[PDB]
Structures are given as C-alpha cells and as structure tokens.
Write a protein that binds this ligand. Structure first.
Ligand SMILES: Cc1cn([C@H]2C[C@H](O)[C@@H](COP(=O)(O)OP(=O)(O)O[C@H]3O[C@H](C)[C@@H](O)[C@H](N)[C@H]3O)O2)c(=O)[nH]c1=O
Ligand SMILES: Cc1cn([C@H]2C[C@H](O)[C@@H](COP(=O)(O)OP(=O)(O)O[C@H]3O[C@H](C)[C@@H](O)[C@H](N)[C@H]3O)O2)c(=O)[nH]c1=O
Ligand SMILES: Nc1nc(=O)c2c([nH]1)NC[C@@H](CNc1ccc(C(=O)N[C@@H](CCC(=O)O)C(=O)O)cc1)N2C=O
Ligand SMILES: Nc1nc(=O)c2c([nH]1)NC[C@@H](CNc1ccc(C(=O)N[C@@H](CCC(=O)O)C(=O)O)cc1)N2C=O
Ligand SMILES: [K+]
Ligand SMILES: [K+]
Lengths: 270, 270
C-alpha cells in the first residue's frame, strides 16, 4: 500500500523522497504528484519525475491521493490548492517558505527582501483550507544575508526546508508531533497581484531599500531587474557614505546611494 | 545670551521648553522657532507660540539661530530641513518619532502600523544634512498595541519623546553625550508621496493587515478611513476564527476577516 505521497518539485521534494526511501518506506509504499511544469529533466533544480523514473516510483493524481486512507500527504512546493474535505486522510502536511505567520502566499523569496526583512524561515505546518494558515509543527528562522538575491534566499529555503522535513518526519510517521494555532498578530500575506516583477525602482528611498528593490528581483531563471534598460546580476550594499541621492553609470556597474547616502554597487549583466 | 533654541510644535516642544525653564535656563537665555501651522492657539495640542507669549520667550528666525555661536539648537517636530553648514554651532539635535534607522521621513504614526510593525520608538540624534540620518544619542523602543490607531501612536511618540528629551538634556548641555552612526542595514524612508491618506483597503490580505489598513489612518483631527463610503472611528482585531474572507455590513459596524479568518470589527462614525 502507498504510505506516503510527495507532491511538489525541486531539490526539497527529491531529497526529501530520497531520505524517505533510505530510512522509512520502500518504493512500493511511496508515490509522487509532480507540478504541471515538471518535464523529467534536472537543471538548476533536480526533477521529481526524473527521480521517480530512476527509482521506479509511481505517479498518482490528487484524486487518487484523496481516496488513499491514512496516506501521509507531504506538499513540498506543490502547485495546487487542496481542500482537506476531499481527503480521507487528515495527515496532510506542507513546508511553507516563510517564518509563519509572516509572508503567507506566494513569491516568498521576493516579499521579505522587498519589505526590508533581515530574517526569514521555513515552516512545516498542517494543511487546512486557507492559504498557509494551518497549525505550525516546526520552524527554522535564518538570516537574509545583506547581499542575498531572491535566488540565494530561495536556495536557503530549499536547504533549510529539507533539514526541517528530515528533523520532523519520524514524529510525523509515528503521529507523536505537536501542532499550534498560528497567531493572528504579525500574520501577513502576498498574492501574485501584489508583486509587479517590472516595478519602477523608487530612488527616493534608503540605500538598503534601493538595494532591496533590485536584489528582490535577481533570479536569472525567471528575470533580472533593469536600471536605464540594463539588466543587473548582483547588488552590493556597502556602509561607505558617498553623499545623498547619488547615481552614476560606469561600464560594468551603477554606483547608487539613497536618502541616507550609502554606496550601492549594482553589477551590470553586460 | 541665547543658550538654547527649541524649534517645532505640540506638547513635546512646549513641555520640553517648560522643563528647560524649570531646570536649566532663564527665559532670556531661550528662544523658539514655531512651525508655520502655529497661530498662537491651543487646540488638541498646545501652541509653542502661545507658550512663548505667556512666558516672555523671544521668537527668532532660523537665519538668526545660524549666527548664534554656542547655541543648542533642538528640533521637536520642526517642519523645516536645516543646512548644517549655515550654523556657527555644531550643537544641532532632533527628536525623531521612529525606531531609527527604520521609518525615517514623515507620517511615522501611519507607516509602522501600515507596514505590520508591533513596536516603534523615539530617537534623539545629531542633525546632519540628511532626513533623519544623523548619529544616534539615545533611543526608546515601545510596543504598538494591537488596537492602537495612528492617533494613539502619535500620543505615545509625544510622551516618550518628552521623556527622552528630559533624560538626555543635562548630558547635552554639559557636552558629555556619546553618538553612534546609524546602521545602513534596516534603514527605511517614507516621504509624503509614499502615503495616500485616502488609502483604498486591500481585503486580499490577513485580518492583521486589513485592521492595519484601517487603524493606520484613524486620526480624527486629520481624517478617518472609509469602508463603502462610510467613516470608521475604531478597528478591533481578535484571534476569533469567523471564516476566511468574510465581509458583513451591519447598521453600526462592519465584521471583516481576511485570508486567515480573524474577527475585525470596524465601528462606523457617529
Ligand atoms: C514565477 C517566478 C518566481 N520567482 C522566484 C521568486 C519565488 O519565490 C520563487 C519560486 O517561485 P514559485 O515556484 O513559482 O513559487 P512561489 O515562491 O511563488 O511559492 C508559491 O508557489 C509555489 C509553487 C507553491 O508551492 C508555494 N507553496 C507557494 O508559496 O522564484 C521569480 O523571481 N519570478 C517569477 O516569475
Ligand atoms: C498631516 C497629517 C498627519 N497625520 C498624522 C500622521 C502623522 O504621523 C501625524 C503627525 O503629522 P505631522 O505633524 O505632519 O508629522 P509627521 O509625522 O508627518 O512627521 C514629519 O513632519 C513633522 C512636522 C516633522 O517635524 C517630523 N520630524 C517629520 O517626521 O499626524 C495624518 O494622519 N494625516 C495627515 O494628513
Ligand atoms: N488548503 C491548502 N492550504 C495550503 O496552505 C496549501 C495547499 N492547500 N496546497 C499546497 C500548498 C500550495 N500553496 C499555494 C498558495 C497559493 C496559491 C495561489 O494560486 N495563490 C493565488 C491566490 C488564490 C486565492 O486567492 O485563493 C495568487 O494569486 O497568489 C497556490 C498554491 N499549500 C501551502 O503552501
Ligand atoms: N537637516 C535636517 N535633518 C533632519 O533630520 C531634520 C532637520 N534637518 N530639521 C528638523 C527635522 C525636519 N524633518 C523633516 C522631514 C521631512 C520634511 C519634508 O519636507 N519632506 C518632504 C521631502 C522633501 C525632500 O525630498 O527634500 C516630503 O515630501 O516628505 C521636512 C522636515 N529633522 C528631523 O526630523
Ligand atoms: K507555501
Ligand atoms: K523626524
């Protein structure tokens, strides 16, 4: 019988499945639900379907998972909203890429940088019918490094999320895990509508904030931001005072300061 | 000679001047520079100009203060940015109503609430030529209570600002105070153009955030927020679950919940 389903994508799903097969269940006891964008090829992330091909793991549909009594359903960057009533199992779990209750919703590699955070986290929670609202089982809070891009933060999510899954999976299998109501205070949410990938930079901001408005959008597989129609691959915030509200194009980089006058080096793609 | 000049408005300027006269300097050793909104009339705050009238304190121009060597220049909600090179004195101080380096700029009774903070602060800093960028002498951080309005937050800034002035003024008069450069990290700025006082509420947000979008604009002397063209005097958030994305207009109030289902009561005006 299928004891566990991994639904989702990327290194967190693959490496979590790997850890299951090494320590808990056999290929017959596990199934995958891939994302609509999985096409069997490793690239900047490993493919779940490719892992499933290599290890003889069967694909199921959501509808199939609904009817599997006492399946552990683990959502690891799964692309589908799930109604808990459809599931015969109530052992439904999700790894969300934020320090819940903050930064519910999407683009959580962009939203904390853009909203001036210096920390984020990964949260293992119970799935309920709301978006990232379910009861928290565990959480790892970690720094946003000052020059991290959205891509760096995403990679840290994948890594800490894998660690949190590994740490918690035994008590989830054994059904000896605790869960707690999420606080209503400091609860925040961003829908897709709340992010403009092409947003005009506001230069009437601090160096930290101009730097954030650039680096929140540096994620080359998706996009790079532009200044004067030139793509930016990296932004560096220094503590060097160069004067208020500076802007100078060199051939390889822009030198920028905001209202507090700290030097930013924005490296051009050219 | 004039030893100290208080520039600005409201109970912090008046009460800090009263403290100077009781503890430090005679009326003939002090001067004021009132804000342009000061017509000499006590209202929901005391008039600095009215207080100077009753206490035989001289009004000076900025242009006069520039020429007074040794003057302790203290801005307490002063409405004008000064050019520090124009002063003969280097004893230029400001009380800013944020937890610097966060929320430089204006509307600091709105911006921390609107940006989901649970604390703010008052900061005593050296004036330099930037907006709220000068080195910190002292800071006091305090809670934003879950149902505080901008108005409540402003009255807390007034009282903690007055506290911090009275704590530090002796060390400032004896020139025995330390100052520290502000961090470049976590530095944030909001100008008048960054706030729309007729904020349209985004309901595709948590209960905390909808609540924040209402209570950040509750300051009756300036404006009240509206839902469906109806003025709101009070927003109350509890951790009570009432279902996701609720909106129920009653005769005297709205009952609202966001993506996480927490109870908001928005009380209608008179
Ligand atoms: C689509 C897209 C993504 N990104 C970055 C920023 C985003 O955090 C990250 C991952 O994108 P995603 O895989 O589409 O998912 P997202 O971060 O929006 O998270 C959400 O969607 C996924 C699929 C859910 O499983 C997850 N639980 C959701 O929070 O890649 C971009 O920079 N530009 C983009 O266009
Ligand atoms: C003008 C205005 C003000 N307010 C509230 C919100 C604001 O934080 C508070 C104080 O208004 P303010 O006196 O204009 O001061 P503000 O917070 O914008 O601070 C700035 O202006 C003052 C005058 C400077 O001395 C201060 N150092 C600046 O930070 O009153 C409103 O709600 N609506 C308004 O239209
Ligand atoms: N019931 C449930 N709760 C969850 O927290 C959860 C699931 N299912 N399924 C797995 C995963 C999926 N996460 C998400 C989160 C948001 C969107 C999404 O499409 N957001 C839309 C808004 C949709 C709406 O308003 O209803 C957007 O425009 O951003 C998709 C998948 N997840 C936990 O992460
Ligand atoms: N040089 C200096 N630095 C300060 O930090 C400081 C002073 N002066 N003087 C007293 C007080 C003045 N605070 C302020 C803050 C903002 C505006 C203001 O007019 N802001 C405009 C933007 C104008 C511009 O971009 O130059 C706005 O639209 O927000 C005025 C006074 N103050 C510390 O509080
Ligand atoms: K998520
Ligand atoms: K200020």
């Amino acid at each position: 019988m299928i004891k566990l389903c991994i639904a989702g994508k990327n290194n967190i799903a693959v490496n979590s499945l790997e850890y299951i097969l090494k320590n808990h269940f056999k290929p017959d006891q596990v199934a995958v639900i891939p994302n609509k964008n999985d096409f069997g090829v490793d690239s900047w992330q490993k493919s779940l379907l490719h892992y499933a091909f290599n290890n003889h793991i069967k694909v199921i549909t959501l509808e199939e998972a609904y009817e599997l009594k006492q399946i552990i359903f683990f959502s690891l960057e799964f692309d589908r909203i799930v109604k808990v009533e459809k599931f015969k199992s109530d052992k439904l779990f999700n790894m969300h890429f934020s320090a819940l209750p903050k930064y519910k919703g999407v683009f959580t590699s962009i939203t904390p940088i853009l909203n001036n955070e210096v920390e984020s986290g990964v949260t293992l929670h119970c799935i309920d019918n709301g978006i990232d609202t379910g009861n928290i089982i565990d959480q790892y809070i970690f720094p946003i490094n000052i020059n991290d891009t959205a891509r760096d933060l995403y990679f840290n999510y994948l890594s800490y999320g894998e660690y949190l899954f590994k740490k918690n999976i035994q008590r989830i299998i054994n059904n000896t895990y605790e869960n707690f109501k999420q606080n209503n205070i400091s609860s925040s949410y961003f829908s897709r509508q709340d992010i403009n990938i092409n947003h005009k930079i506001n230069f009437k901001k601090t160096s930290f904030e101009i730097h954030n408005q650039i680096r929140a959008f540096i994620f080359k597989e998706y996009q790079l931001p532009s200044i004067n129609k030139t793509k930016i691959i990296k932004s560096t915030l220094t503590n060097e005072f160069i004067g208020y509200n500076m802007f100078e194009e060199f051939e390889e980089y822009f030198m920028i300061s905001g209202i507090d006058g700290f030097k930013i080096i924005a490296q051009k793609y050219n």
